[PDB]
Amino acid sequence: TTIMAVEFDGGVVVGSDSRVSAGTAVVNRVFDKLSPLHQRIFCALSGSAADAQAIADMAAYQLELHGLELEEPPLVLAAANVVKNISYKYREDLLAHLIVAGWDQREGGQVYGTMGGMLIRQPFTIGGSGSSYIYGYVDAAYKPGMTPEECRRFTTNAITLAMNRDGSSGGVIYLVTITAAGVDHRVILGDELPKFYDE
Template sequence: MDSRGAQKISTGTTIMAVEFDGGVVVGSDSRVSAGESVVNRFFNKLERLHDRIYCALSGSAADAQAIADTVQYQLELHSLNMDKTPLVLAAATLVRNISYKYKEELSAHLMVAGWDPKQGGQVYGTMGGMLTRQPFAIGGSGSTFIYGYVDSAYKPGMSREECRQFTKNAIALAMSRDGSSGGVIYLVTVTEAGVKEEVILGNELPQFYDK
């Protein structure tokens, strides 16, 4: 909430994740708002759940962070007890279960993506208690502006760099249309080799319209 406790701080946002052969690209904008006010321009909405598993946060910032923290803790315990790396599906299932169990108390939508030795790169949506694997997924308030773009621009079998550019273009387009999305773009690329985190600044963003 803000200092008066009147408005809930939410990640009115654009989040996205894309699979490619060997990994995933996850991205988000960085703006956090409370009502019509921007309260944080540079909030990283990509949360690490385990070594090669990330989630993208949307909805109430506090609620989404609470879910991510709980899943992160449970995955760490699971990894220690089983002495092996948790699966991306296990992380997504935990997110789905918590989100559904507390659907009346929490206002958050988390997208889970990552890499594991069993199924490689994976992207899961967890909206409304459902768990669906998708080649790519978008979410947040900005996603409503880019469904046409992503449906036309996505092509099966895209390379790592093509998926990175696809994600960057889609989020930049949403930021140009959605008043609740903005700031910079955070990108995370996850493969067997490791994790690469990037910040795409304003002067590096794709430009879709003449100023």
Template sequence: IMFEETGPEWLSEEVKTGTTIIAIEFDGGVVLGSDSRVSAGASVVNRVMNKLSPLHDKIYCALSGSAADAQTIAEIVNYQLDVHSIEIGEDPQVRSAATLVRNISYKYKEELSAHLIVAGWDRRDGGQVFATMKGLLTRQPFAVGGSGSSYVYGFVDAEYRRGMRKEECQQFVVNTLSLAMNRDGSSGGVAYIVTIDEHGTEEKVVLGNQLPTFFDQ
């Protein structure tokens, strides 16, 4: 008897980043954060993927949607920004990076399934957060995205205050990710945090057992 050889079911599923992503401005910079779980169908295929991708020295994007699509957009924009910065002889603006992401997302809206939040710091406008989706490009004081975001809109709307310091924004991001990861089955793992200001970029990982809890488990 010949048995047909079949691989695991997740091999034929599209790999999605599930995801909770967030970015917030503070006076002088930005903080980005994401969970690390990647799923295909009902299976978790990567527990520790870093979804915060550098586009330039002080510009990052947070990835959600199809993992392959989002990573491809980030790599293309990273290359285009390198060429652009050489042409103009200085670091690119955050708005330029966000516009490139928006243009690619819109041009290939039928083929690509990805939502990227672009955030960073430049000399002209300081810390900035841009939401990019299909043809949309909007600067916002903070932005959330991914499947986990629907669980935390009430929290971020209630907790956000203009003028928060860097440390307060970092805690805001960690708290938001922790709440979303508790509720959303597609979000989980560790929390990746990137803080960007005029002095540089600081990356941090908060392990799952170090995330804050908001109820007795």
């Protein structure tokens, strides 16, 4: 699994890969790891598939109720806290890292990392098994104030490289862009995928 979230002025970009694997066998080469907590809030799934999906569902549920009680779209910070809280309450019992990114009126596009039950906000975040191989890439390929399209290239590139290096990462790249206007969901097929040094 390789998951990525990048922050820009208008909103955010959340990236994922398409593969789930059981050891050396792949059980789903087409899996969308981008789950919406709310209309403008998304999370990226990593770790135990069952645990990740279970947390995603509860977070969406609590935030749905939270939204109704406030009669306002939930803050992303709020979204991030619920996920952090569930992850922390059961750190030993649940094996998952969820990246929560979205848009709210108060603070715009924001990116949060909840790995291990901690809360941190970053210009961009990577998670999953695949993230190890791209730590160098992201550090050298990052510039402040990248445009939506620049952000999409960035997350796509990083994940592509991770996918090729990682055995646990593969398939197609799933991309969402969150802005004040709406949610843009796109998929990149293998033929569309960026090319680098392969051999």
